[PDB]
């Protein structure tokens, strides 16, 4: 009744329920649940040594930028949901007359709705009746099922005359449906139009996001709609995938909390030592509080706020913004943007750019991502022969020389047969056109390219009716009538497809086509004539790399088609199982054929893809394709798209159901103790799967069993593999021996091969959609894989690694200042600077460092980034960032802080360095002395880590050391006179006025740029690496 | 659809690069090292042109001479002059029962320094830089706002109020301030100069604007308990604290960094101080032992650092220094590795 709205359910907030879920979803983090409870503490009075809304106050400006970059995405979000929402529905008034132009929202229980051409359907609707006299219609499923078929939507024979909107008018009746359940092919419903007993099939079953393509106009009797239906129900929520770097970043937050406590023993612990044992000569204090422990605690609190900025609040809101600006640089790429299909290249998931670069096991679709999903007729084995160069496209006009004489050649009827057959035998409709021509809605691929195959030479398919005689057009004659009499389609275990037809001199004969061991068993051919050849050209095709069919023939007789028309009729009225008794009598005539050829239509790779592949090998990735070809055909693609190179072992494996500990422990043992050189073995290594022998291979018994000689090889190729274990193969390799994946699918037998890896891949273009929606990113061509994730990783994943370490260096390197001042001072939890410039450190000068380290830092050209693909092993393997090197970082903020303490306290001896009058520099003079000088040492070490520097991060670099030197007079000028900031008074006159102040500047941030800079010295002249060495190739 | 064709766009941005090459990393080692060169030691000669005087006084009480000059232990002065000391500096205690234990320091200033003079107090082991010593000071009531009970900044709660009234200088830094009195005459014995000082323009300017004279009927504050002794009555309408004329009350509120601080209280700069025999009368009112350490007073002039502190001339020559170690060895390291 009170449906819900019409959007699919990719939803974060609503209007009302934004502050609940939001502030669950960030206050359920850690480095903002304690600054949460850092802040929560810091209301205790006596107890902030900074401020509050110091702390609340950041914490408050990371929370709306936080709620800026969520509120964009989410109103982009329900921009599309607009962009699905808002569709004409024509709609039947009750009241007054014809169907009216409404929007959505006026579908309820019952609706009778009739919705036009082009356009996409509202929800799920019944059929009563169509445009077409039967009550079918022609649609596609673009969003339901991803195979692009035109379903033939047959309806209800007793309600398929109200067609006029007088008809409709006394037309109502209870529907008692099935339950929402999300059973695709599954329904059960009841109707009483007119107090009569009306059953529901799940023919009639025009789902959610269907686009009607081909009728005037549809009706539709709308059961569910909003969250209910077959396609919003299983509206997958595609949980948040943890990247190799924050896992990593959970742990070293870890060890920051970690070194925290200890400051804050080390310290606190001092504060009671001192705070006990100078008791007589801290009495101008009025220590007389006699809870020791009790200022321990209140004292702990002042430490646990004094340094709690070391953990930045501004580092997991600054890395998902340049991580998200990263997935933007991505998708504004040319050369990710192939325009022939115009798809912009679209990252789907924003925080997971980084996952681009340790890719290890890229898994790939052939079909379609490989090889293009165009099925050009190629070849075909014709009456015994073949072309033996390659010149199937002259010696097809020696096939039409073939025909043509007529009075002397006997392959001319067989060949008048074989086009025969691929010019009739099909599943696909014929498309009128608005050009000259006639296009060809595909149910099937083959069928299409056997079918435009006969038209290049001449026979185009005239329309069909299903139940009448059709007609052709032949190149050397004018119009031949032919006729449908019986269909016998396609089944997986059958492995063939024949049909009965009727010449129009009353000759019924039988056509039979399907693959070669099932069609090569059944068959005669005058005393074995033309099987030897078939066999070899079979060969052939199976040593080219070619999709190859079989193609045979035999005869009925007046009594065999009126006996055989019978069992065939009356075999033909089963609903108890309409693939098993229509093929057990599909093949009761099936028995003693006549073998004519084969065709062999091509699939041909794409335009980068061998290219590709021979690239990301040389990366150290694992290349595997999964697919569901047999063995020699994968073969010869992988030894065609550069995956199986020259004399590589090809260990070949085709069990069956205990054949196992055969072929998986003998290749362990060859694997193993046949140990040759092992890295030109390595490199010469493949394995070559049946996959129901590895359906007895992916289970918890064999899976590690399998995983020993799985990852030894260098490009694993499956083969005949059914789609459930393309998730099973993802899930066994990120469950055991945790590596980073990636996936690439075009169908939607893909989406839990794609939505089950590190990260994700989809493929747009050709008639699968399912692929590049679900996905991490969509991508044009499997070619934008190679500058994608060689250059986008290595750049992604350098950049992120240099700015998070960073930004873990700049809070500890101002911070740490704060715990060495502990000494100096009574242990007492005394802030150096001012409560704001500690609120404007992480927020507000040295925020830009991090971001143009993050985007714009080009550590080696991609020029000679993807000329030398040994580089991305060396961010494949784990160096850039790691704990070890965050400690590196760390302590380097240890020795540039202490260096700027121990320095300034050296230089600023007993507050004695004026020369204005005999005034001193003060407690808050020091301060922001410390406080430049680490703001110097900070962006210094960031002009030390970059690398290609100049455009937007000298804006940055040094805009942040002169930005702080043009605020710091403004704010501590003015902003002292307003009560915010009564600390700053004179500070302006006595730190920029002074003479020992900008010496200071000047040479105590080179005295910690002396091990910053000649460690960089040494480490790319002395001992580099290979990228030292290759960026100035 | 497609994205632009920008520089920007298609990370083709224009980029200079930082090529550390040893023909540009060997001339900034040098170049850094043979610009800190002339900058440290000239810093080091203006950290060395200060002339001061540093006397602790602190065992002038118990470590007496109440009847003559005697001479002073070697530990206590730091003298630092450019000529030589010839007769080395004594001192004596008086207690005329007013002034309660004064001391006559009497130095030997060897020739006459002649740049301008300033005269602080060195105090050691005053932990000034307290978490509970920076606050504990209504800024409200230095302003000169007559602030009522429980409207007072609570930061002065133990010095906050009293016997049903308030301190009118509350809290920690107003309380306990540094009250022994300096004479302000260099007394010149065997007739040199009877120098004079000054104590006004001493504190900071925006101290002089900050704290200004109160605003109260001098009957509902009360003095806070450590200098109660010099208001024994307590608060009255002639004796009240103008504290925008006391200027040093807003020497000692403006808190210094560290334990070991000077502060500033006498100067004099329109004059030279001559070569003579000085002596300077001390009124030890400041007990030792109410903070931890010495209390020196000093008596130096001004260089381009603050008087003498050579650790900034030395902390150009570690990085001169570090500029041309690592400025040969990476340059035998250039000569002798590839050789
Ligand atoms: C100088 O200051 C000291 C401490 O700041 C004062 O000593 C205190 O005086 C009061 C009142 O006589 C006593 O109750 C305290 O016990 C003293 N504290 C000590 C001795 O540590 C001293 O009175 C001041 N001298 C003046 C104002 O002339
Ligand atoms: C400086 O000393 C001279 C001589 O003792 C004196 O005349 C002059 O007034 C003093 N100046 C100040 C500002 O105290
Ligand atoms: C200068 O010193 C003499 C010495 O007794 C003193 O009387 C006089 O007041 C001083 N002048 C000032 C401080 O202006």
Redesign the interface.
């Known amino acids: 009744f009170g449906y819900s709205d019409n959007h699919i359910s990719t939803t974060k907030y609503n209007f009302a329920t934004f502050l609940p879920k939001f502030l669950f979803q960030e206050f359920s983090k850690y480095a903002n649940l304690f600054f949460l409870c850092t802040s929560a503490i810091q209301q205790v009075?006596?107890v902030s040594?900074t401020n509050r809304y110091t702390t609340i106050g950041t914490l408050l400006v990371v929370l709306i930028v936080s709620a800026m970059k969520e509120c964009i995405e989410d109103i982009k979000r329900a921009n599309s949901d607009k962009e699905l929402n808002n569709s004409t529905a024509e709609i039947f008034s009750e009241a007054h007359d014809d169907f009216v132009e409404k929007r959505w929202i006026d579908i309820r229980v019952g609706d009778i709705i009739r919705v036009k051409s082009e356009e996409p359907i509202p929800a799920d609707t019944i059929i009563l009746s169509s445009s077409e006299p039967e009550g079918l219609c022609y649609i596609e499923t673009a969003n339901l099922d991803g195979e692009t078929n035109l379903k033939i939507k047959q309806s209800r024979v007793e309600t398929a005359k109200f067609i006029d909107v007088k008809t409709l008018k006394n037309m109502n009746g209870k529907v008692v449906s099935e339950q929402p359940n999300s059973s695709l092919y599954t329904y059960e419903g009841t109707m009483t139009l007119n107090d009569r007993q009306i059953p529901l099939s799940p023919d009639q079953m025009i789902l959610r996001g269907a686009t009607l393509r081909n009728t005037a106009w549809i009706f539709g009797l709308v059961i569910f709609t909003g969250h209910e239906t077959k396609l919003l129900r299983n509206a997958t929520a595609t949980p948040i995938k943890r990247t190799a770097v924050e896992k990593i970043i959970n742990r070293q937050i870890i060890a920051l909390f970690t070194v925290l406590i200890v400051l804050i023993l080390i310290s606190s612990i001092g504060n009671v030592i001192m705070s006990t044992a100078?008791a007589?000569?801290?009495?101008?204090?009025?220590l007389?509080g006699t809870n020791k422990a009790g200022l321990f605690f209140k004292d702990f609190l002042?430490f646990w706020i004094l340094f709690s900025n070391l953990v930045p609040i501004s580092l997991f809101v600054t890395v998902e913004l340049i991580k998200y600006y990263q997935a933007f640089?991505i998708?504004?790429?040319?050369?990710l943007?192939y325009?022939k299909t115009?798809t912009?290249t679209v990252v789907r998931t924003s925080s997971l750019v980084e996952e681009l670069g340790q890719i290890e096991y890229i898994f790939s679709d052939k079909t379609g991502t490989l090889t293009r999903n165009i099925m050009e007729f190629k070849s075909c084995s014709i009456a015994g022969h073949c072309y033996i160069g390659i010149e199937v496209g002259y010696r097809k006009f020696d096939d039409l020389k073939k025909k043509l004489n007529d009075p002397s050649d006997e392959d001319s009827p067989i060949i008048n047969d074989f086009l025969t057959l691929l010019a009739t035998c099909h599943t696909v409709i014929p498309e009128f056109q608005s050009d000259g021509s006639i296009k060809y809605q595909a149910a099937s691929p083959d069928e299409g390219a056997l079918v435009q195959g006969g038209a290049d030479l001449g026979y185009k398919f005239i329309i069909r009716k299903p139940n009448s005689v059709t007609v052709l057009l032949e190149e050397t004659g004018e119009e031949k009538e032919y006729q449908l009499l019986n269909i016998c389609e396609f089944n997986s275990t059958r492995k063939r497809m024949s049909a009965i037809f009727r010449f129009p001199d009353g000759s019924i004969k039988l056509f039979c086509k399907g693959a070669d061991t099932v069609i090569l068993e059944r068959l005669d051919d005058e005393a074995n004539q033309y099987v030897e050849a078939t066999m070899r050209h079979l060969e052939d095709y199976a040593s080219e790399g070619l999709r190859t069919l079989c193609l045979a023939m035999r005869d009925i007789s007046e009594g065999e088609y009126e006996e055989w028309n019978s069992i065939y009729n009356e075999a033909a009225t089963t609903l108890d199982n309409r693939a098993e008794k229509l093929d057990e009598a599909a093949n009761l005539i099936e028995k003693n054929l006549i073998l004519i050829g084969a065709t062999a239509i091509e699939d041909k790779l794409q335009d980068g893809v061998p290219e590709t592949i021979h690239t990301l090998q040389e990366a150290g990735i694992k290349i595997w394709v999964l697919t569901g070809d047999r063995q020699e055909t994968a073969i010869n693609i992988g030894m065609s798209c550069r995956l199986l190179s020259e004399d590589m072992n090809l260990l070949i494996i085709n069990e069956e159901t205990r054949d196992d500990t055969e072929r998986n422990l003998l290749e362990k043992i060859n694997a193993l103790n046949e140990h040759q050189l092992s890295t030109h073995d390595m490199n010469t290594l493949a394995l070559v799967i049946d996959g129901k022998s590895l359906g007895f291979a992916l289970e918890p018994e064999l899976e590690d069993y399998l995983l020993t000689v799985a990852k030894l090889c260098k490009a694993v190729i499956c083969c005949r593999v059914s789609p459930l274990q393309k998730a099973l193969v993802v899930k066994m390799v990120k469950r055991k021996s945790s590596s980073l994946l990636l996936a690439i699918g075009d169908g939607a037998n893909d989406v839990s091969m794609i939505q089950a890896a590190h990260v994700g891949v989809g493929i747009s273009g050709m008639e699968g959609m399912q692929a590049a929606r679900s996905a991490d990113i969509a991508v044009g061509q499997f070619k934008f894989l190679k500058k994608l994730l060689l250059v986008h990783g290595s750049?992604s994943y350098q950049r992120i690694s240099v700015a998070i370490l960073y930004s873990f260096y700049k809070n500890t390197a101002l911070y740490m200042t704060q715990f060495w001042y502990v000494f100096?001072?009574?242990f007492?939890?005394?802030s150096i600077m001012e409560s704001w410039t500690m609120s404007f450190y992480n927020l507000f000068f040295t925020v830009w460092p991090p971001f143009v380290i993050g985007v714009?830092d080009?550590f080696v050209s991609?020029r000679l980034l993807e000329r030398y693909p040994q580089l991305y092993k060396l961010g494949q393997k784990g160096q850039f960032f790691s704990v070890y090197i965050f400690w590196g970082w760390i302590i380097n903020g240890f020795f540039h802080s202490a260096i700027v303490f121990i320095?300034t306290?050296?230089?600023?001896?007993?507050?004695?360095?004026?020369?204005m009058?005999?005034?001193?520099?003060?407690?808050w003079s020091?301060?922001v002395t410390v406080y430049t000088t680490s703001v110097i040492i900070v962006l210094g070490k960031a002009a030390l880590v970059t690398?290609?520097?100049?455009?937007?991060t000298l804006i940055a670099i040094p805009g942040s050391l002169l930005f702080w030197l043009i605020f710091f007079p403004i704010y501590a000028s003015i902003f002292p006179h307003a009560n915010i900031s009564?600390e700053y008074?004179?500070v302006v006159?006595?730190t920029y006025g002074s003479?020992?102040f900008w010496?200071?500047l000047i040479?105590?941030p080179?005295?910690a740029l002396?091990r910053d800079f000649?460690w960089?010295?040494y480490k790319?002249?002395?001992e580099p690496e290979t990228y030292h060495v290759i960026?100035?190739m | 659809k497609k994205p632009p064709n920008t520089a920007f766009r298609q990370q083709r941005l224009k980029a200079w690069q930082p090529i550390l090459s040893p023909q540009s990393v060997l001339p900034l080692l040098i170049f850094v090292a043979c610009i800190f060169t002339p900058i440290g030691i000239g810093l080091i000669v203006s950290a060395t042109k200060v002339q001061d005087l540093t006397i602790d006084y602190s065992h002038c009480d118990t470590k007496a001479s109440t009847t003559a000059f005697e001479d002073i232990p070697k530990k206590y002065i730091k003298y630092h002059f450019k000529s030589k000391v010839e007769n080395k500096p004594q001192w004596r205690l008086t207690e005329n029962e007013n002034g309660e234990q004064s001391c006559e320091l009497q130095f030997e200033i060897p020739n006459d320094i002649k740049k301008s003079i300033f005269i602080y107090y060195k105090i050691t082991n005053f932990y000034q830089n307290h978490r509970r010593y920076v606050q504990s000071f209504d800024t409200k009531q230095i302003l000169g706002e007559p602030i009522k009970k429980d409207d007072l900044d609570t930061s002065c709660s133990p010095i906050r109020s009293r016997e049903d009234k308030i301190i009118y200088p509350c809290g920690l830094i107003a309380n306990s301030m540094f009250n022994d009195t300096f004479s302000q005459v260099l007394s010149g014995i065997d007739d040199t100069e009877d120098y004079n000082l000054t104590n006004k323009h001493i504190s900071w300017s925006i101290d002089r604007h900050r704290f200004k004279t109160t605003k109260y009927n001098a009957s509902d504050i009360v003095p806070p308990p450590n200098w109660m002794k010099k208001y024994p009555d307590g608060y009255t309408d002639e004796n009240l604290p103008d504290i925008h004329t006391w200027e040093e009350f807003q020497v000692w509120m403006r808190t210094a960094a560290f334990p070991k601080f000077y502060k500033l209280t006498l100067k004099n700069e329109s004059a030279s101080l001559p070569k003579g025999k000085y002596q300077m009368n001390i009124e030890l009112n400041y007990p030792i032992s109410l903070f931890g350490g010495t209390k020196s007073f000093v008596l130096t002039t001004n260089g381009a650092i603050g008087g003498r502190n050579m650790s900034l001339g030395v902390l150009y020559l570690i990085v001169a220094g570090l500029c041309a170690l690592f400025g040969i060895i990476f340059l035998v390291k250039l000569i002798f590795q590839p050789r």
Do not use: C
């Not at chain 1, 998708?331 to 050369?335: A, E, N």
């Open positions: 009075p006596h040594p100078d007589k000569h801290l009495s101008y204090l009025y007389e002042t640089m998708g504004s790429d040319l050369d943007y325009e115009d912009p750049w100096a001072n009574a007492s939890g005394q714009f080009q991609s320095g306290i050296l230089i600023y001896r007993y507050g004695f360095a004026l020369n009058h005999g005034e001193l520099a003060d407690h020091w301060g690398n290609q520097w100049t455009k937007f009564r008074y004179g006159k006595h003479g020992v010496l200071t040479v105590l080179i005295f002396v000649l960089k010295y790319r002249m002395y960026q100035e």
